[PDB]
Design a protein around this ligand. Structure first.
Ligand SMILES: [Zn+2]
Ligand SMILES: [Zn+2]
Lengths: 114, 673, 108, 222
């Protein structure tokens, strides 16, 4: 799923097929450095696009003076009783009125939806 | 314009070395004298602004310069000589300025010259008439904007208009496109869209990997670290993969320069000229605001990478597109940045015709004399023409110029005079039916009057600015850069592109100038310096967006500001001690300036106004309760300062229907008094 | 150890003259070049530009044993001078000015 | 022994060098190096949990600078020399990089005075003149015209009206060295009138365009 760079000329390693041992070989097209593939899959295309933005929001958003705050929902990892919440603010806005939270305690940065 | 912007133009001009012997000429210092009128028999005398109106004169001041001339013939002696205070021309003078005859006079003397002590000033007197310059709007420069033309081949587009610090007549613009997905073809259906670029001074589109290699960086591990800042992202790397496939066969520097060098304003017949031609166009016309020297070409690579890294984020749907009419992307051209633009094209035109007079006169080998070379009618009649008639161009150029500037002052009633010296103008057409450049935008709060506008065909095209709105004048970014480097800011060259994922890119005036790893302490250190005015002047804006993880700083001229009240934890910073000593300015010498320099008010730009939380009134919004917010950062002075000049004479304007307030503001301008 | 328990003081001099100009020769760490493999080297200004501005051409272990091209940095003393500090037998330190910065890279 | 030959001794000795970044004002103090050119003394204190290096200015040079150690990783650095005898030498490899920084001795205003003192002359300003300076003088003969008049009086008189046959000695003389000469080259030899010179040129020769205008005369091939 990732990418492979050549170890000699630092370029993009293409996948190739050899008719001897039935194993995927990654080859270069400037030099001919070789090696075998460990996962033996090339292409993947996610159409659902249901990526949870809990992996994209940053912990320093709790320094924003223009975001609402809450005393109801406390943090689990530290027990702080003050959070700051917001919406998806991105694409995939068909049914996007969820409410992600971020703890505001210094050096906690814990994030969670509900 | 007349203390700095005119001295720099003659000082930063190429000498005219010319030739056997050869000669030198270079200009050093500029002087001016008070406006003067030459009588019929050649006896000068200072002209007062009143005679200029009665006798249909023109209110202008003569202009001098120091020129030094050295002859270089290696004739065992370098003979130099100088002619100081050489006459050049005459510049109009705006009334009540620091160079007028009415500067700093008292009412007993203003009445003695038959002048009104209430006259505001700020207009020219040209052939008896009274002309006023209208501030023109303009799209902001040196920033990246991402749009989406839903009619043409492109699925996304970026733009960056660049100009190297007030020194270029044109402004080179560069696009970074991306072709459409639904390209009907059984070939590219599989690979996908290819990122393209449309450089200036070339005919054909160019793939981006090619123009990357023309700067060096032929390897594809080094290119793909200027464009992608973290290699744990497979979704983005998949999108840049089909950009390499078409630039795969051309894999070295010199053949790349030939590829772009083959299609220019002149197709190269030989090879070395194309490799020469492609060298400077990619060096002096590509992103001149970053650096124009032939060195420091790693910076032109990073910025071109950031321009492309930002185009992909707009395709994965991770950041929203830019707004065209968002009033934080606009700049205003006052009389300063307008006369300076018109003075360049007439100083070059004055040097272009000292050569033509020197060569014709030095081939015969006689000698040289410069007092006869200077055609004085170039600058005098050049400015006076375009101001008097309006078309912002040249006399033989009455077809290529922008019209509508410099109209006649309105003197029907005293509030029709003030409402003329404070007026903007958006340069879009006067009959286009597109509503989005005409409707009222949220960002006009407090900086443009919402009610005052004319009807007819010019609805929403001309606008008047609010009462406390203040336009900035400009400064040099030198003293902030020297402070930033000593506050732990890593330069771009001496850093590894893997220490860039968790750092906040620091921009200054449009140019990427480093990174930083602890921004929140930098920010509230930059601010507490401006609050008390040690290193940074009060008209710079400093934006920080937490999410996109960067920091911007601006120092240029054209941004529009307005003062606000600074708020600490939940209380104002304006204590009573400031009031009982401010009601005594008459014999205490304590005024507005001593109020800014004490850190209780602050000018807030439009861009900076998106990272702020305002309260509208102290006694009512800053009380602890079950409250709306609790982190207020500023507070307004009085919410009645959001109205213009002609709309703030209406009693109880918050009780009328809205179109009614628009009619009167365009109707109190024609009331007799 | 002495890196934790070592204390010393040495004199520093900055001679107003030198018998040779001092430059920096920089290598990418990522290459991890074994200098021991450099039996010999040749070093000449690059010929593409057909002097002090000329990029260097380094030929190690023969004409094609090893070859690099060195490109001059934009600036070296634009804001702050760079000094070479060398230890002398008397323990005192000697400082040498850096004249230029050249960037050296490997060549297929 | 060759010009393009590089000494590898330093490298092969594994000679190490140190690299230190120094501010210009200090470096300007250093150009005034005391005595031979010693600028002071360096102090190095290493402990189990910390290491401190600093340099102190020569008392003479004066009339604490902590060091910030920098990484040299990612790029191998070596020092190479050019002697005053133009001999080339590699002194060593850089084993340390560092930066001299201020510490508890200044704030921004203090730093600023130094910047101002370095300007002395800033970018030029437009000054305000008093009244109006004289512009038009009363010269009688323009100076350029008088220089031309003198040259024309010193010339226009050496016309070699005689030498009816001797020129031809000098003209042929020149014509043997190059088959043809531009009328101007021939004039540079004969100061006599061009019309009369052309008659002398036409009498003993013919003018060819030679192909790029440039009136050029040559001896008849007969
Ligand atoms: Zn390879
Ligand atoms: Zn927490």
């Amino acid at each position: 799923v990732g990418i492979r760079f050549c170890q000699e000329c630092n370029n993009m390693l293409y996948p190739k097929e050899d008719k001897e041992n039935r194993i995927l070989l990654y080859a270069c097209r400037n030099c001919d450095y070789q090696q075998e593939a460990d996962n033996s899959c090339i292409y993947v295309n996610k159409i659902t696009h249901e990526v949870d933005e809990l992996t994209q929001i940053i912990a320093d958003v709790s320094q924003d003076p223009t975001l609402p705050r809450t005393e109801d929902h406390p943090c689990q990892k530290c027990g702080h009783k003050e959070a700051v919440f917001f919406q998806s603010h991105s694409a995939r806005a068909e049914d996007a009125m969820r409410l992600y939270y971020v703890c505001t305690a210094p050096h906690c940065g814990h994030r969670w939806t509900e | 314009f007349i203390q700095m912007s005119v001295q720099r133009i003659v000082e930063d001009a190429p000498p005219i070395d010319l030739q056997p012997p050869r000669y030198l000429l270079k200009f050093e210092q500029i002087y001016l004298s008070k406006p003067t009128h030459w009588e019929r028999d050649g006896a000068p005398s200072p002209m007062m602004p009143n005679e200029a109106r009665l006798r249909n004169l023109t209110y202008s001041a003569p202009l001098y310069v120091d020129i030094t001339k050295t002859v270089i013939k290696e004739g065992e002696e370098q003979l130099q000589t100088q002619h100081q205070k050489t006459f050049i021309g005459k510049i109009p003078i705006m009334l009540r300025s620091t160079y007028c005859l009415l500067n700093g006079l008292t009412d007993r003397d203003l009445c003695e010259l038959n002048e009104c002590p209430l006259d505001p000033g700020g207009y020219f007197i040209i052939n008896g008439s009274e002309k006023v310059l209208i501030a023109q709007e303009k799209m902001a420069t040196n920033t990246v904007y991402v749009f989406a033309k839903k009619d043409s081949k492109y699925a996304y587009t970026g733009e960056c208009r660049s100009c190297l610090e007030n020194s270029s007549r044109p402004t080179s613009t560069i696009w970074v496109s991306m072709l459409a997905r639904g390209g009907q073809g059984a070939k590219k259906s599989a690979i996908g869209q290819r990122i393209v670029a449309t450089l200036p001074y070339i005919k054909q589109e160019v793939p981006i990997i090619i123009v990357f290699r023309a700067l060096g960086f032929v390897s594809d591990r080094d290119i793909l670290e200027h464009i992608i800042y973290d290699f744990e992202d497979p979704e983005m790397m998949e999108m840049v993969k089909p950009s390499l496939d078409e630039a795969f066969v051309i894999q070295e520097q010199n053949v790349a320069l030939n590829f772009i060098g083959s299609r220019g304003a002149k197709p190269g017949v030989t090879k070395e000229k194309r490799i020469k031609y492609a060298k400077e166009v990619l060096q002096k016309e590509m992103l001149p605001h970053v650096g124009v020297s032939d060195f420091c070409e790693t910076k032109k690579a990073y910025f071109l990478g950031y321009m492309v890294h930002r185009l992909l984020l707009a395709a994965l749907g991770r950041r929203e597109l830019d707004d065209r009419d968002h009033y934080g992307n606009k700049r205003l051209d006052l009389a300063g940045p307008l006369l300076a633009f018109l003075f360049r094209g007439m100083f070059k035109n004055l040097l272009k015709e000292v050569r033509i007079y020197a060569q014709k006169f030095i081939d015969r080998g006689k000698d040289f004399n410069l007092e006869l070379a200077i055609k004085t009618r170039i600058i005098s009649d050049g400015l006076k023409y375009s101001l008097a008639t309006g078309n912002w161009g040249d006399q033989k150029k009455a077809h290529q110029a922008r019209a509508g500037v410099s109209q006649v002052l309105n003197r029907l009633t005293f509030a029709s005079t003030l409402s003329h010296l404070r007026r903007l103008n958006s340069p879009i057409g006067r009959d286009g039916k597109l509503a989005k450049p005409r409707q009222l935008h949220n960002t006009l709060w407090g900086m443009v009057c919402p009610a005052e506008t004319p009807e007819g065909h010019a609805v929403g095209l001309v606008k008047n600015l609010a009462l406390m709105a203040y336009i900035s004048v400009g400064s040099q970014p030198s003293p902030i850069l020297e402070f930033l480097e000593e506050w732990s800011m890593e330069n771009l060259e001496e850093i590894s592109p893997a220490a860039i994922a968790d750092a906040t890119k620091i921009f200054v005036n449009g140019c990427w100038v480093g990174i930083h790893k602890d921004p929140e302490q930098l920010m509230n250190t930059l601010r507490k310096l401006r609050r008390q005015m040690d290193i940074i002047v009060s008209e710079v804006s400093m934006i920080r967006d937490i999410r996109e993880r960067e920091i911007r700083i601006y120092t240029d001229a054209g941004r529009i500001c307005r003062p606000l009240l600074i708020v600490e934890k939940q209380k104002l910073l304006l204590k009573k001690r400031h009031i009982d000593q401010l009601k005594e300015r008459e014999y205490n010498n304590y005024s507005w300036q001593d109020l800014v320099a004490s850190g209780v008010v602050e000018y807030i730009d439009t861009l900076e106004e998106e990272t702020v939380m305002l309260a509208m009134t102290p006694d009512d919004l800053q009380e602890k309760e079950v409250a709306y917010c609790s982190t207020y950062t500023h507070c307004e002075i009085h919410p009645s300062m959001i109205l213009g000049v002609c709309a703030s004479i209406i009693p109880f304007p918050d009780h009328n229907q809205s179109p009614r307030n628009t009619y009167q503001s365009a109707m109190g301008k024609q009331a007799m008094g | 150890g002495p890196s934790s328990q070592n204390v010393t003081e040495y004199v520093v001099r900055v001679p107003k003259n030198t018998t040779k100009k001092y430059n920096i020769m920089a290598f990418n760490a990522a290459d991890k070049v074994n200098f021991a493999t450099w039996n010999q080297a040749r070093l000449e200004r690059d010929l593409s530009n057909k002097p002090e501005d000329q990029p260097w051409l380094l030929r190690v272990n023969g004409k094609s044993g090893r070859k690099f091209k060195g490109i001059k940095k934009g600036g070296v003393t634009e804001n702050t001078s760079y000094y070479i500090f060398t230890q002398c037998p008397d323990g005192a330190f000697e400082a040498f000015p850096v004249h230029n910065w050249y960037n050296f890279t490997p060549l297929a | 022994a060759e010009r393009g030959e590089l000494d590898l001794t330093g490298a092969k000795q594994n000679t190490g060098v140190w690299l230190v970044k120094v501010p210009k004002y200090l470096s300007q103090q250093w150009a005034k190096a005391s005595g031979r050119g010693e600028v002071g003394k360096l102090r190095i204190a290493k402990t189990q949990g910390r290491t401190e290096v600093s340099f102190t200015l020569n008392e003479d040079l004066a009339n604490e600078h902590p060091f910030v150690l920098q990484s040299v990783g990612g790029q191998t650095l070596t020092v190479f020399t050019e002697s005053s005898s133009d001999k080339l030498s590699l002194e060593g490899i850089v084993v340390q990089r560092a930066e001299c920084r201020p510490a508890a001795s200044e704030n921004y205003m203090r730093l600023k005075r130094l910047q101002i003192e370095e300007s002395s002359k800033p970018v030029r300003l437009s000054q305000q003149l008093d009244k109006v300076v004289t512009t038009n003088y009363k010269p009688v003969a323009n100076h350029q015209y008088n220089i031309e008049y003198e040259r024309k009086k010193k010339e226009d008189g050496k016309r070699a009206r005689a030498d009816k046959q001797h020129v031809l000695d000098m003209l042929f003389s020149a014509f043997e060295k190059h088959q043809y000469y531009n009328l101007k080259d021939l004039v540079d030899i004969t100061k006599q009138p061009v019309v009369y010179l052309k008659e002398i040129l036409k009498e003993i020769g013919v003018q060819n365009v030679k192909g790029i205008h440039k009136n050029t005369w040559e001896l008849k091939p007969e």
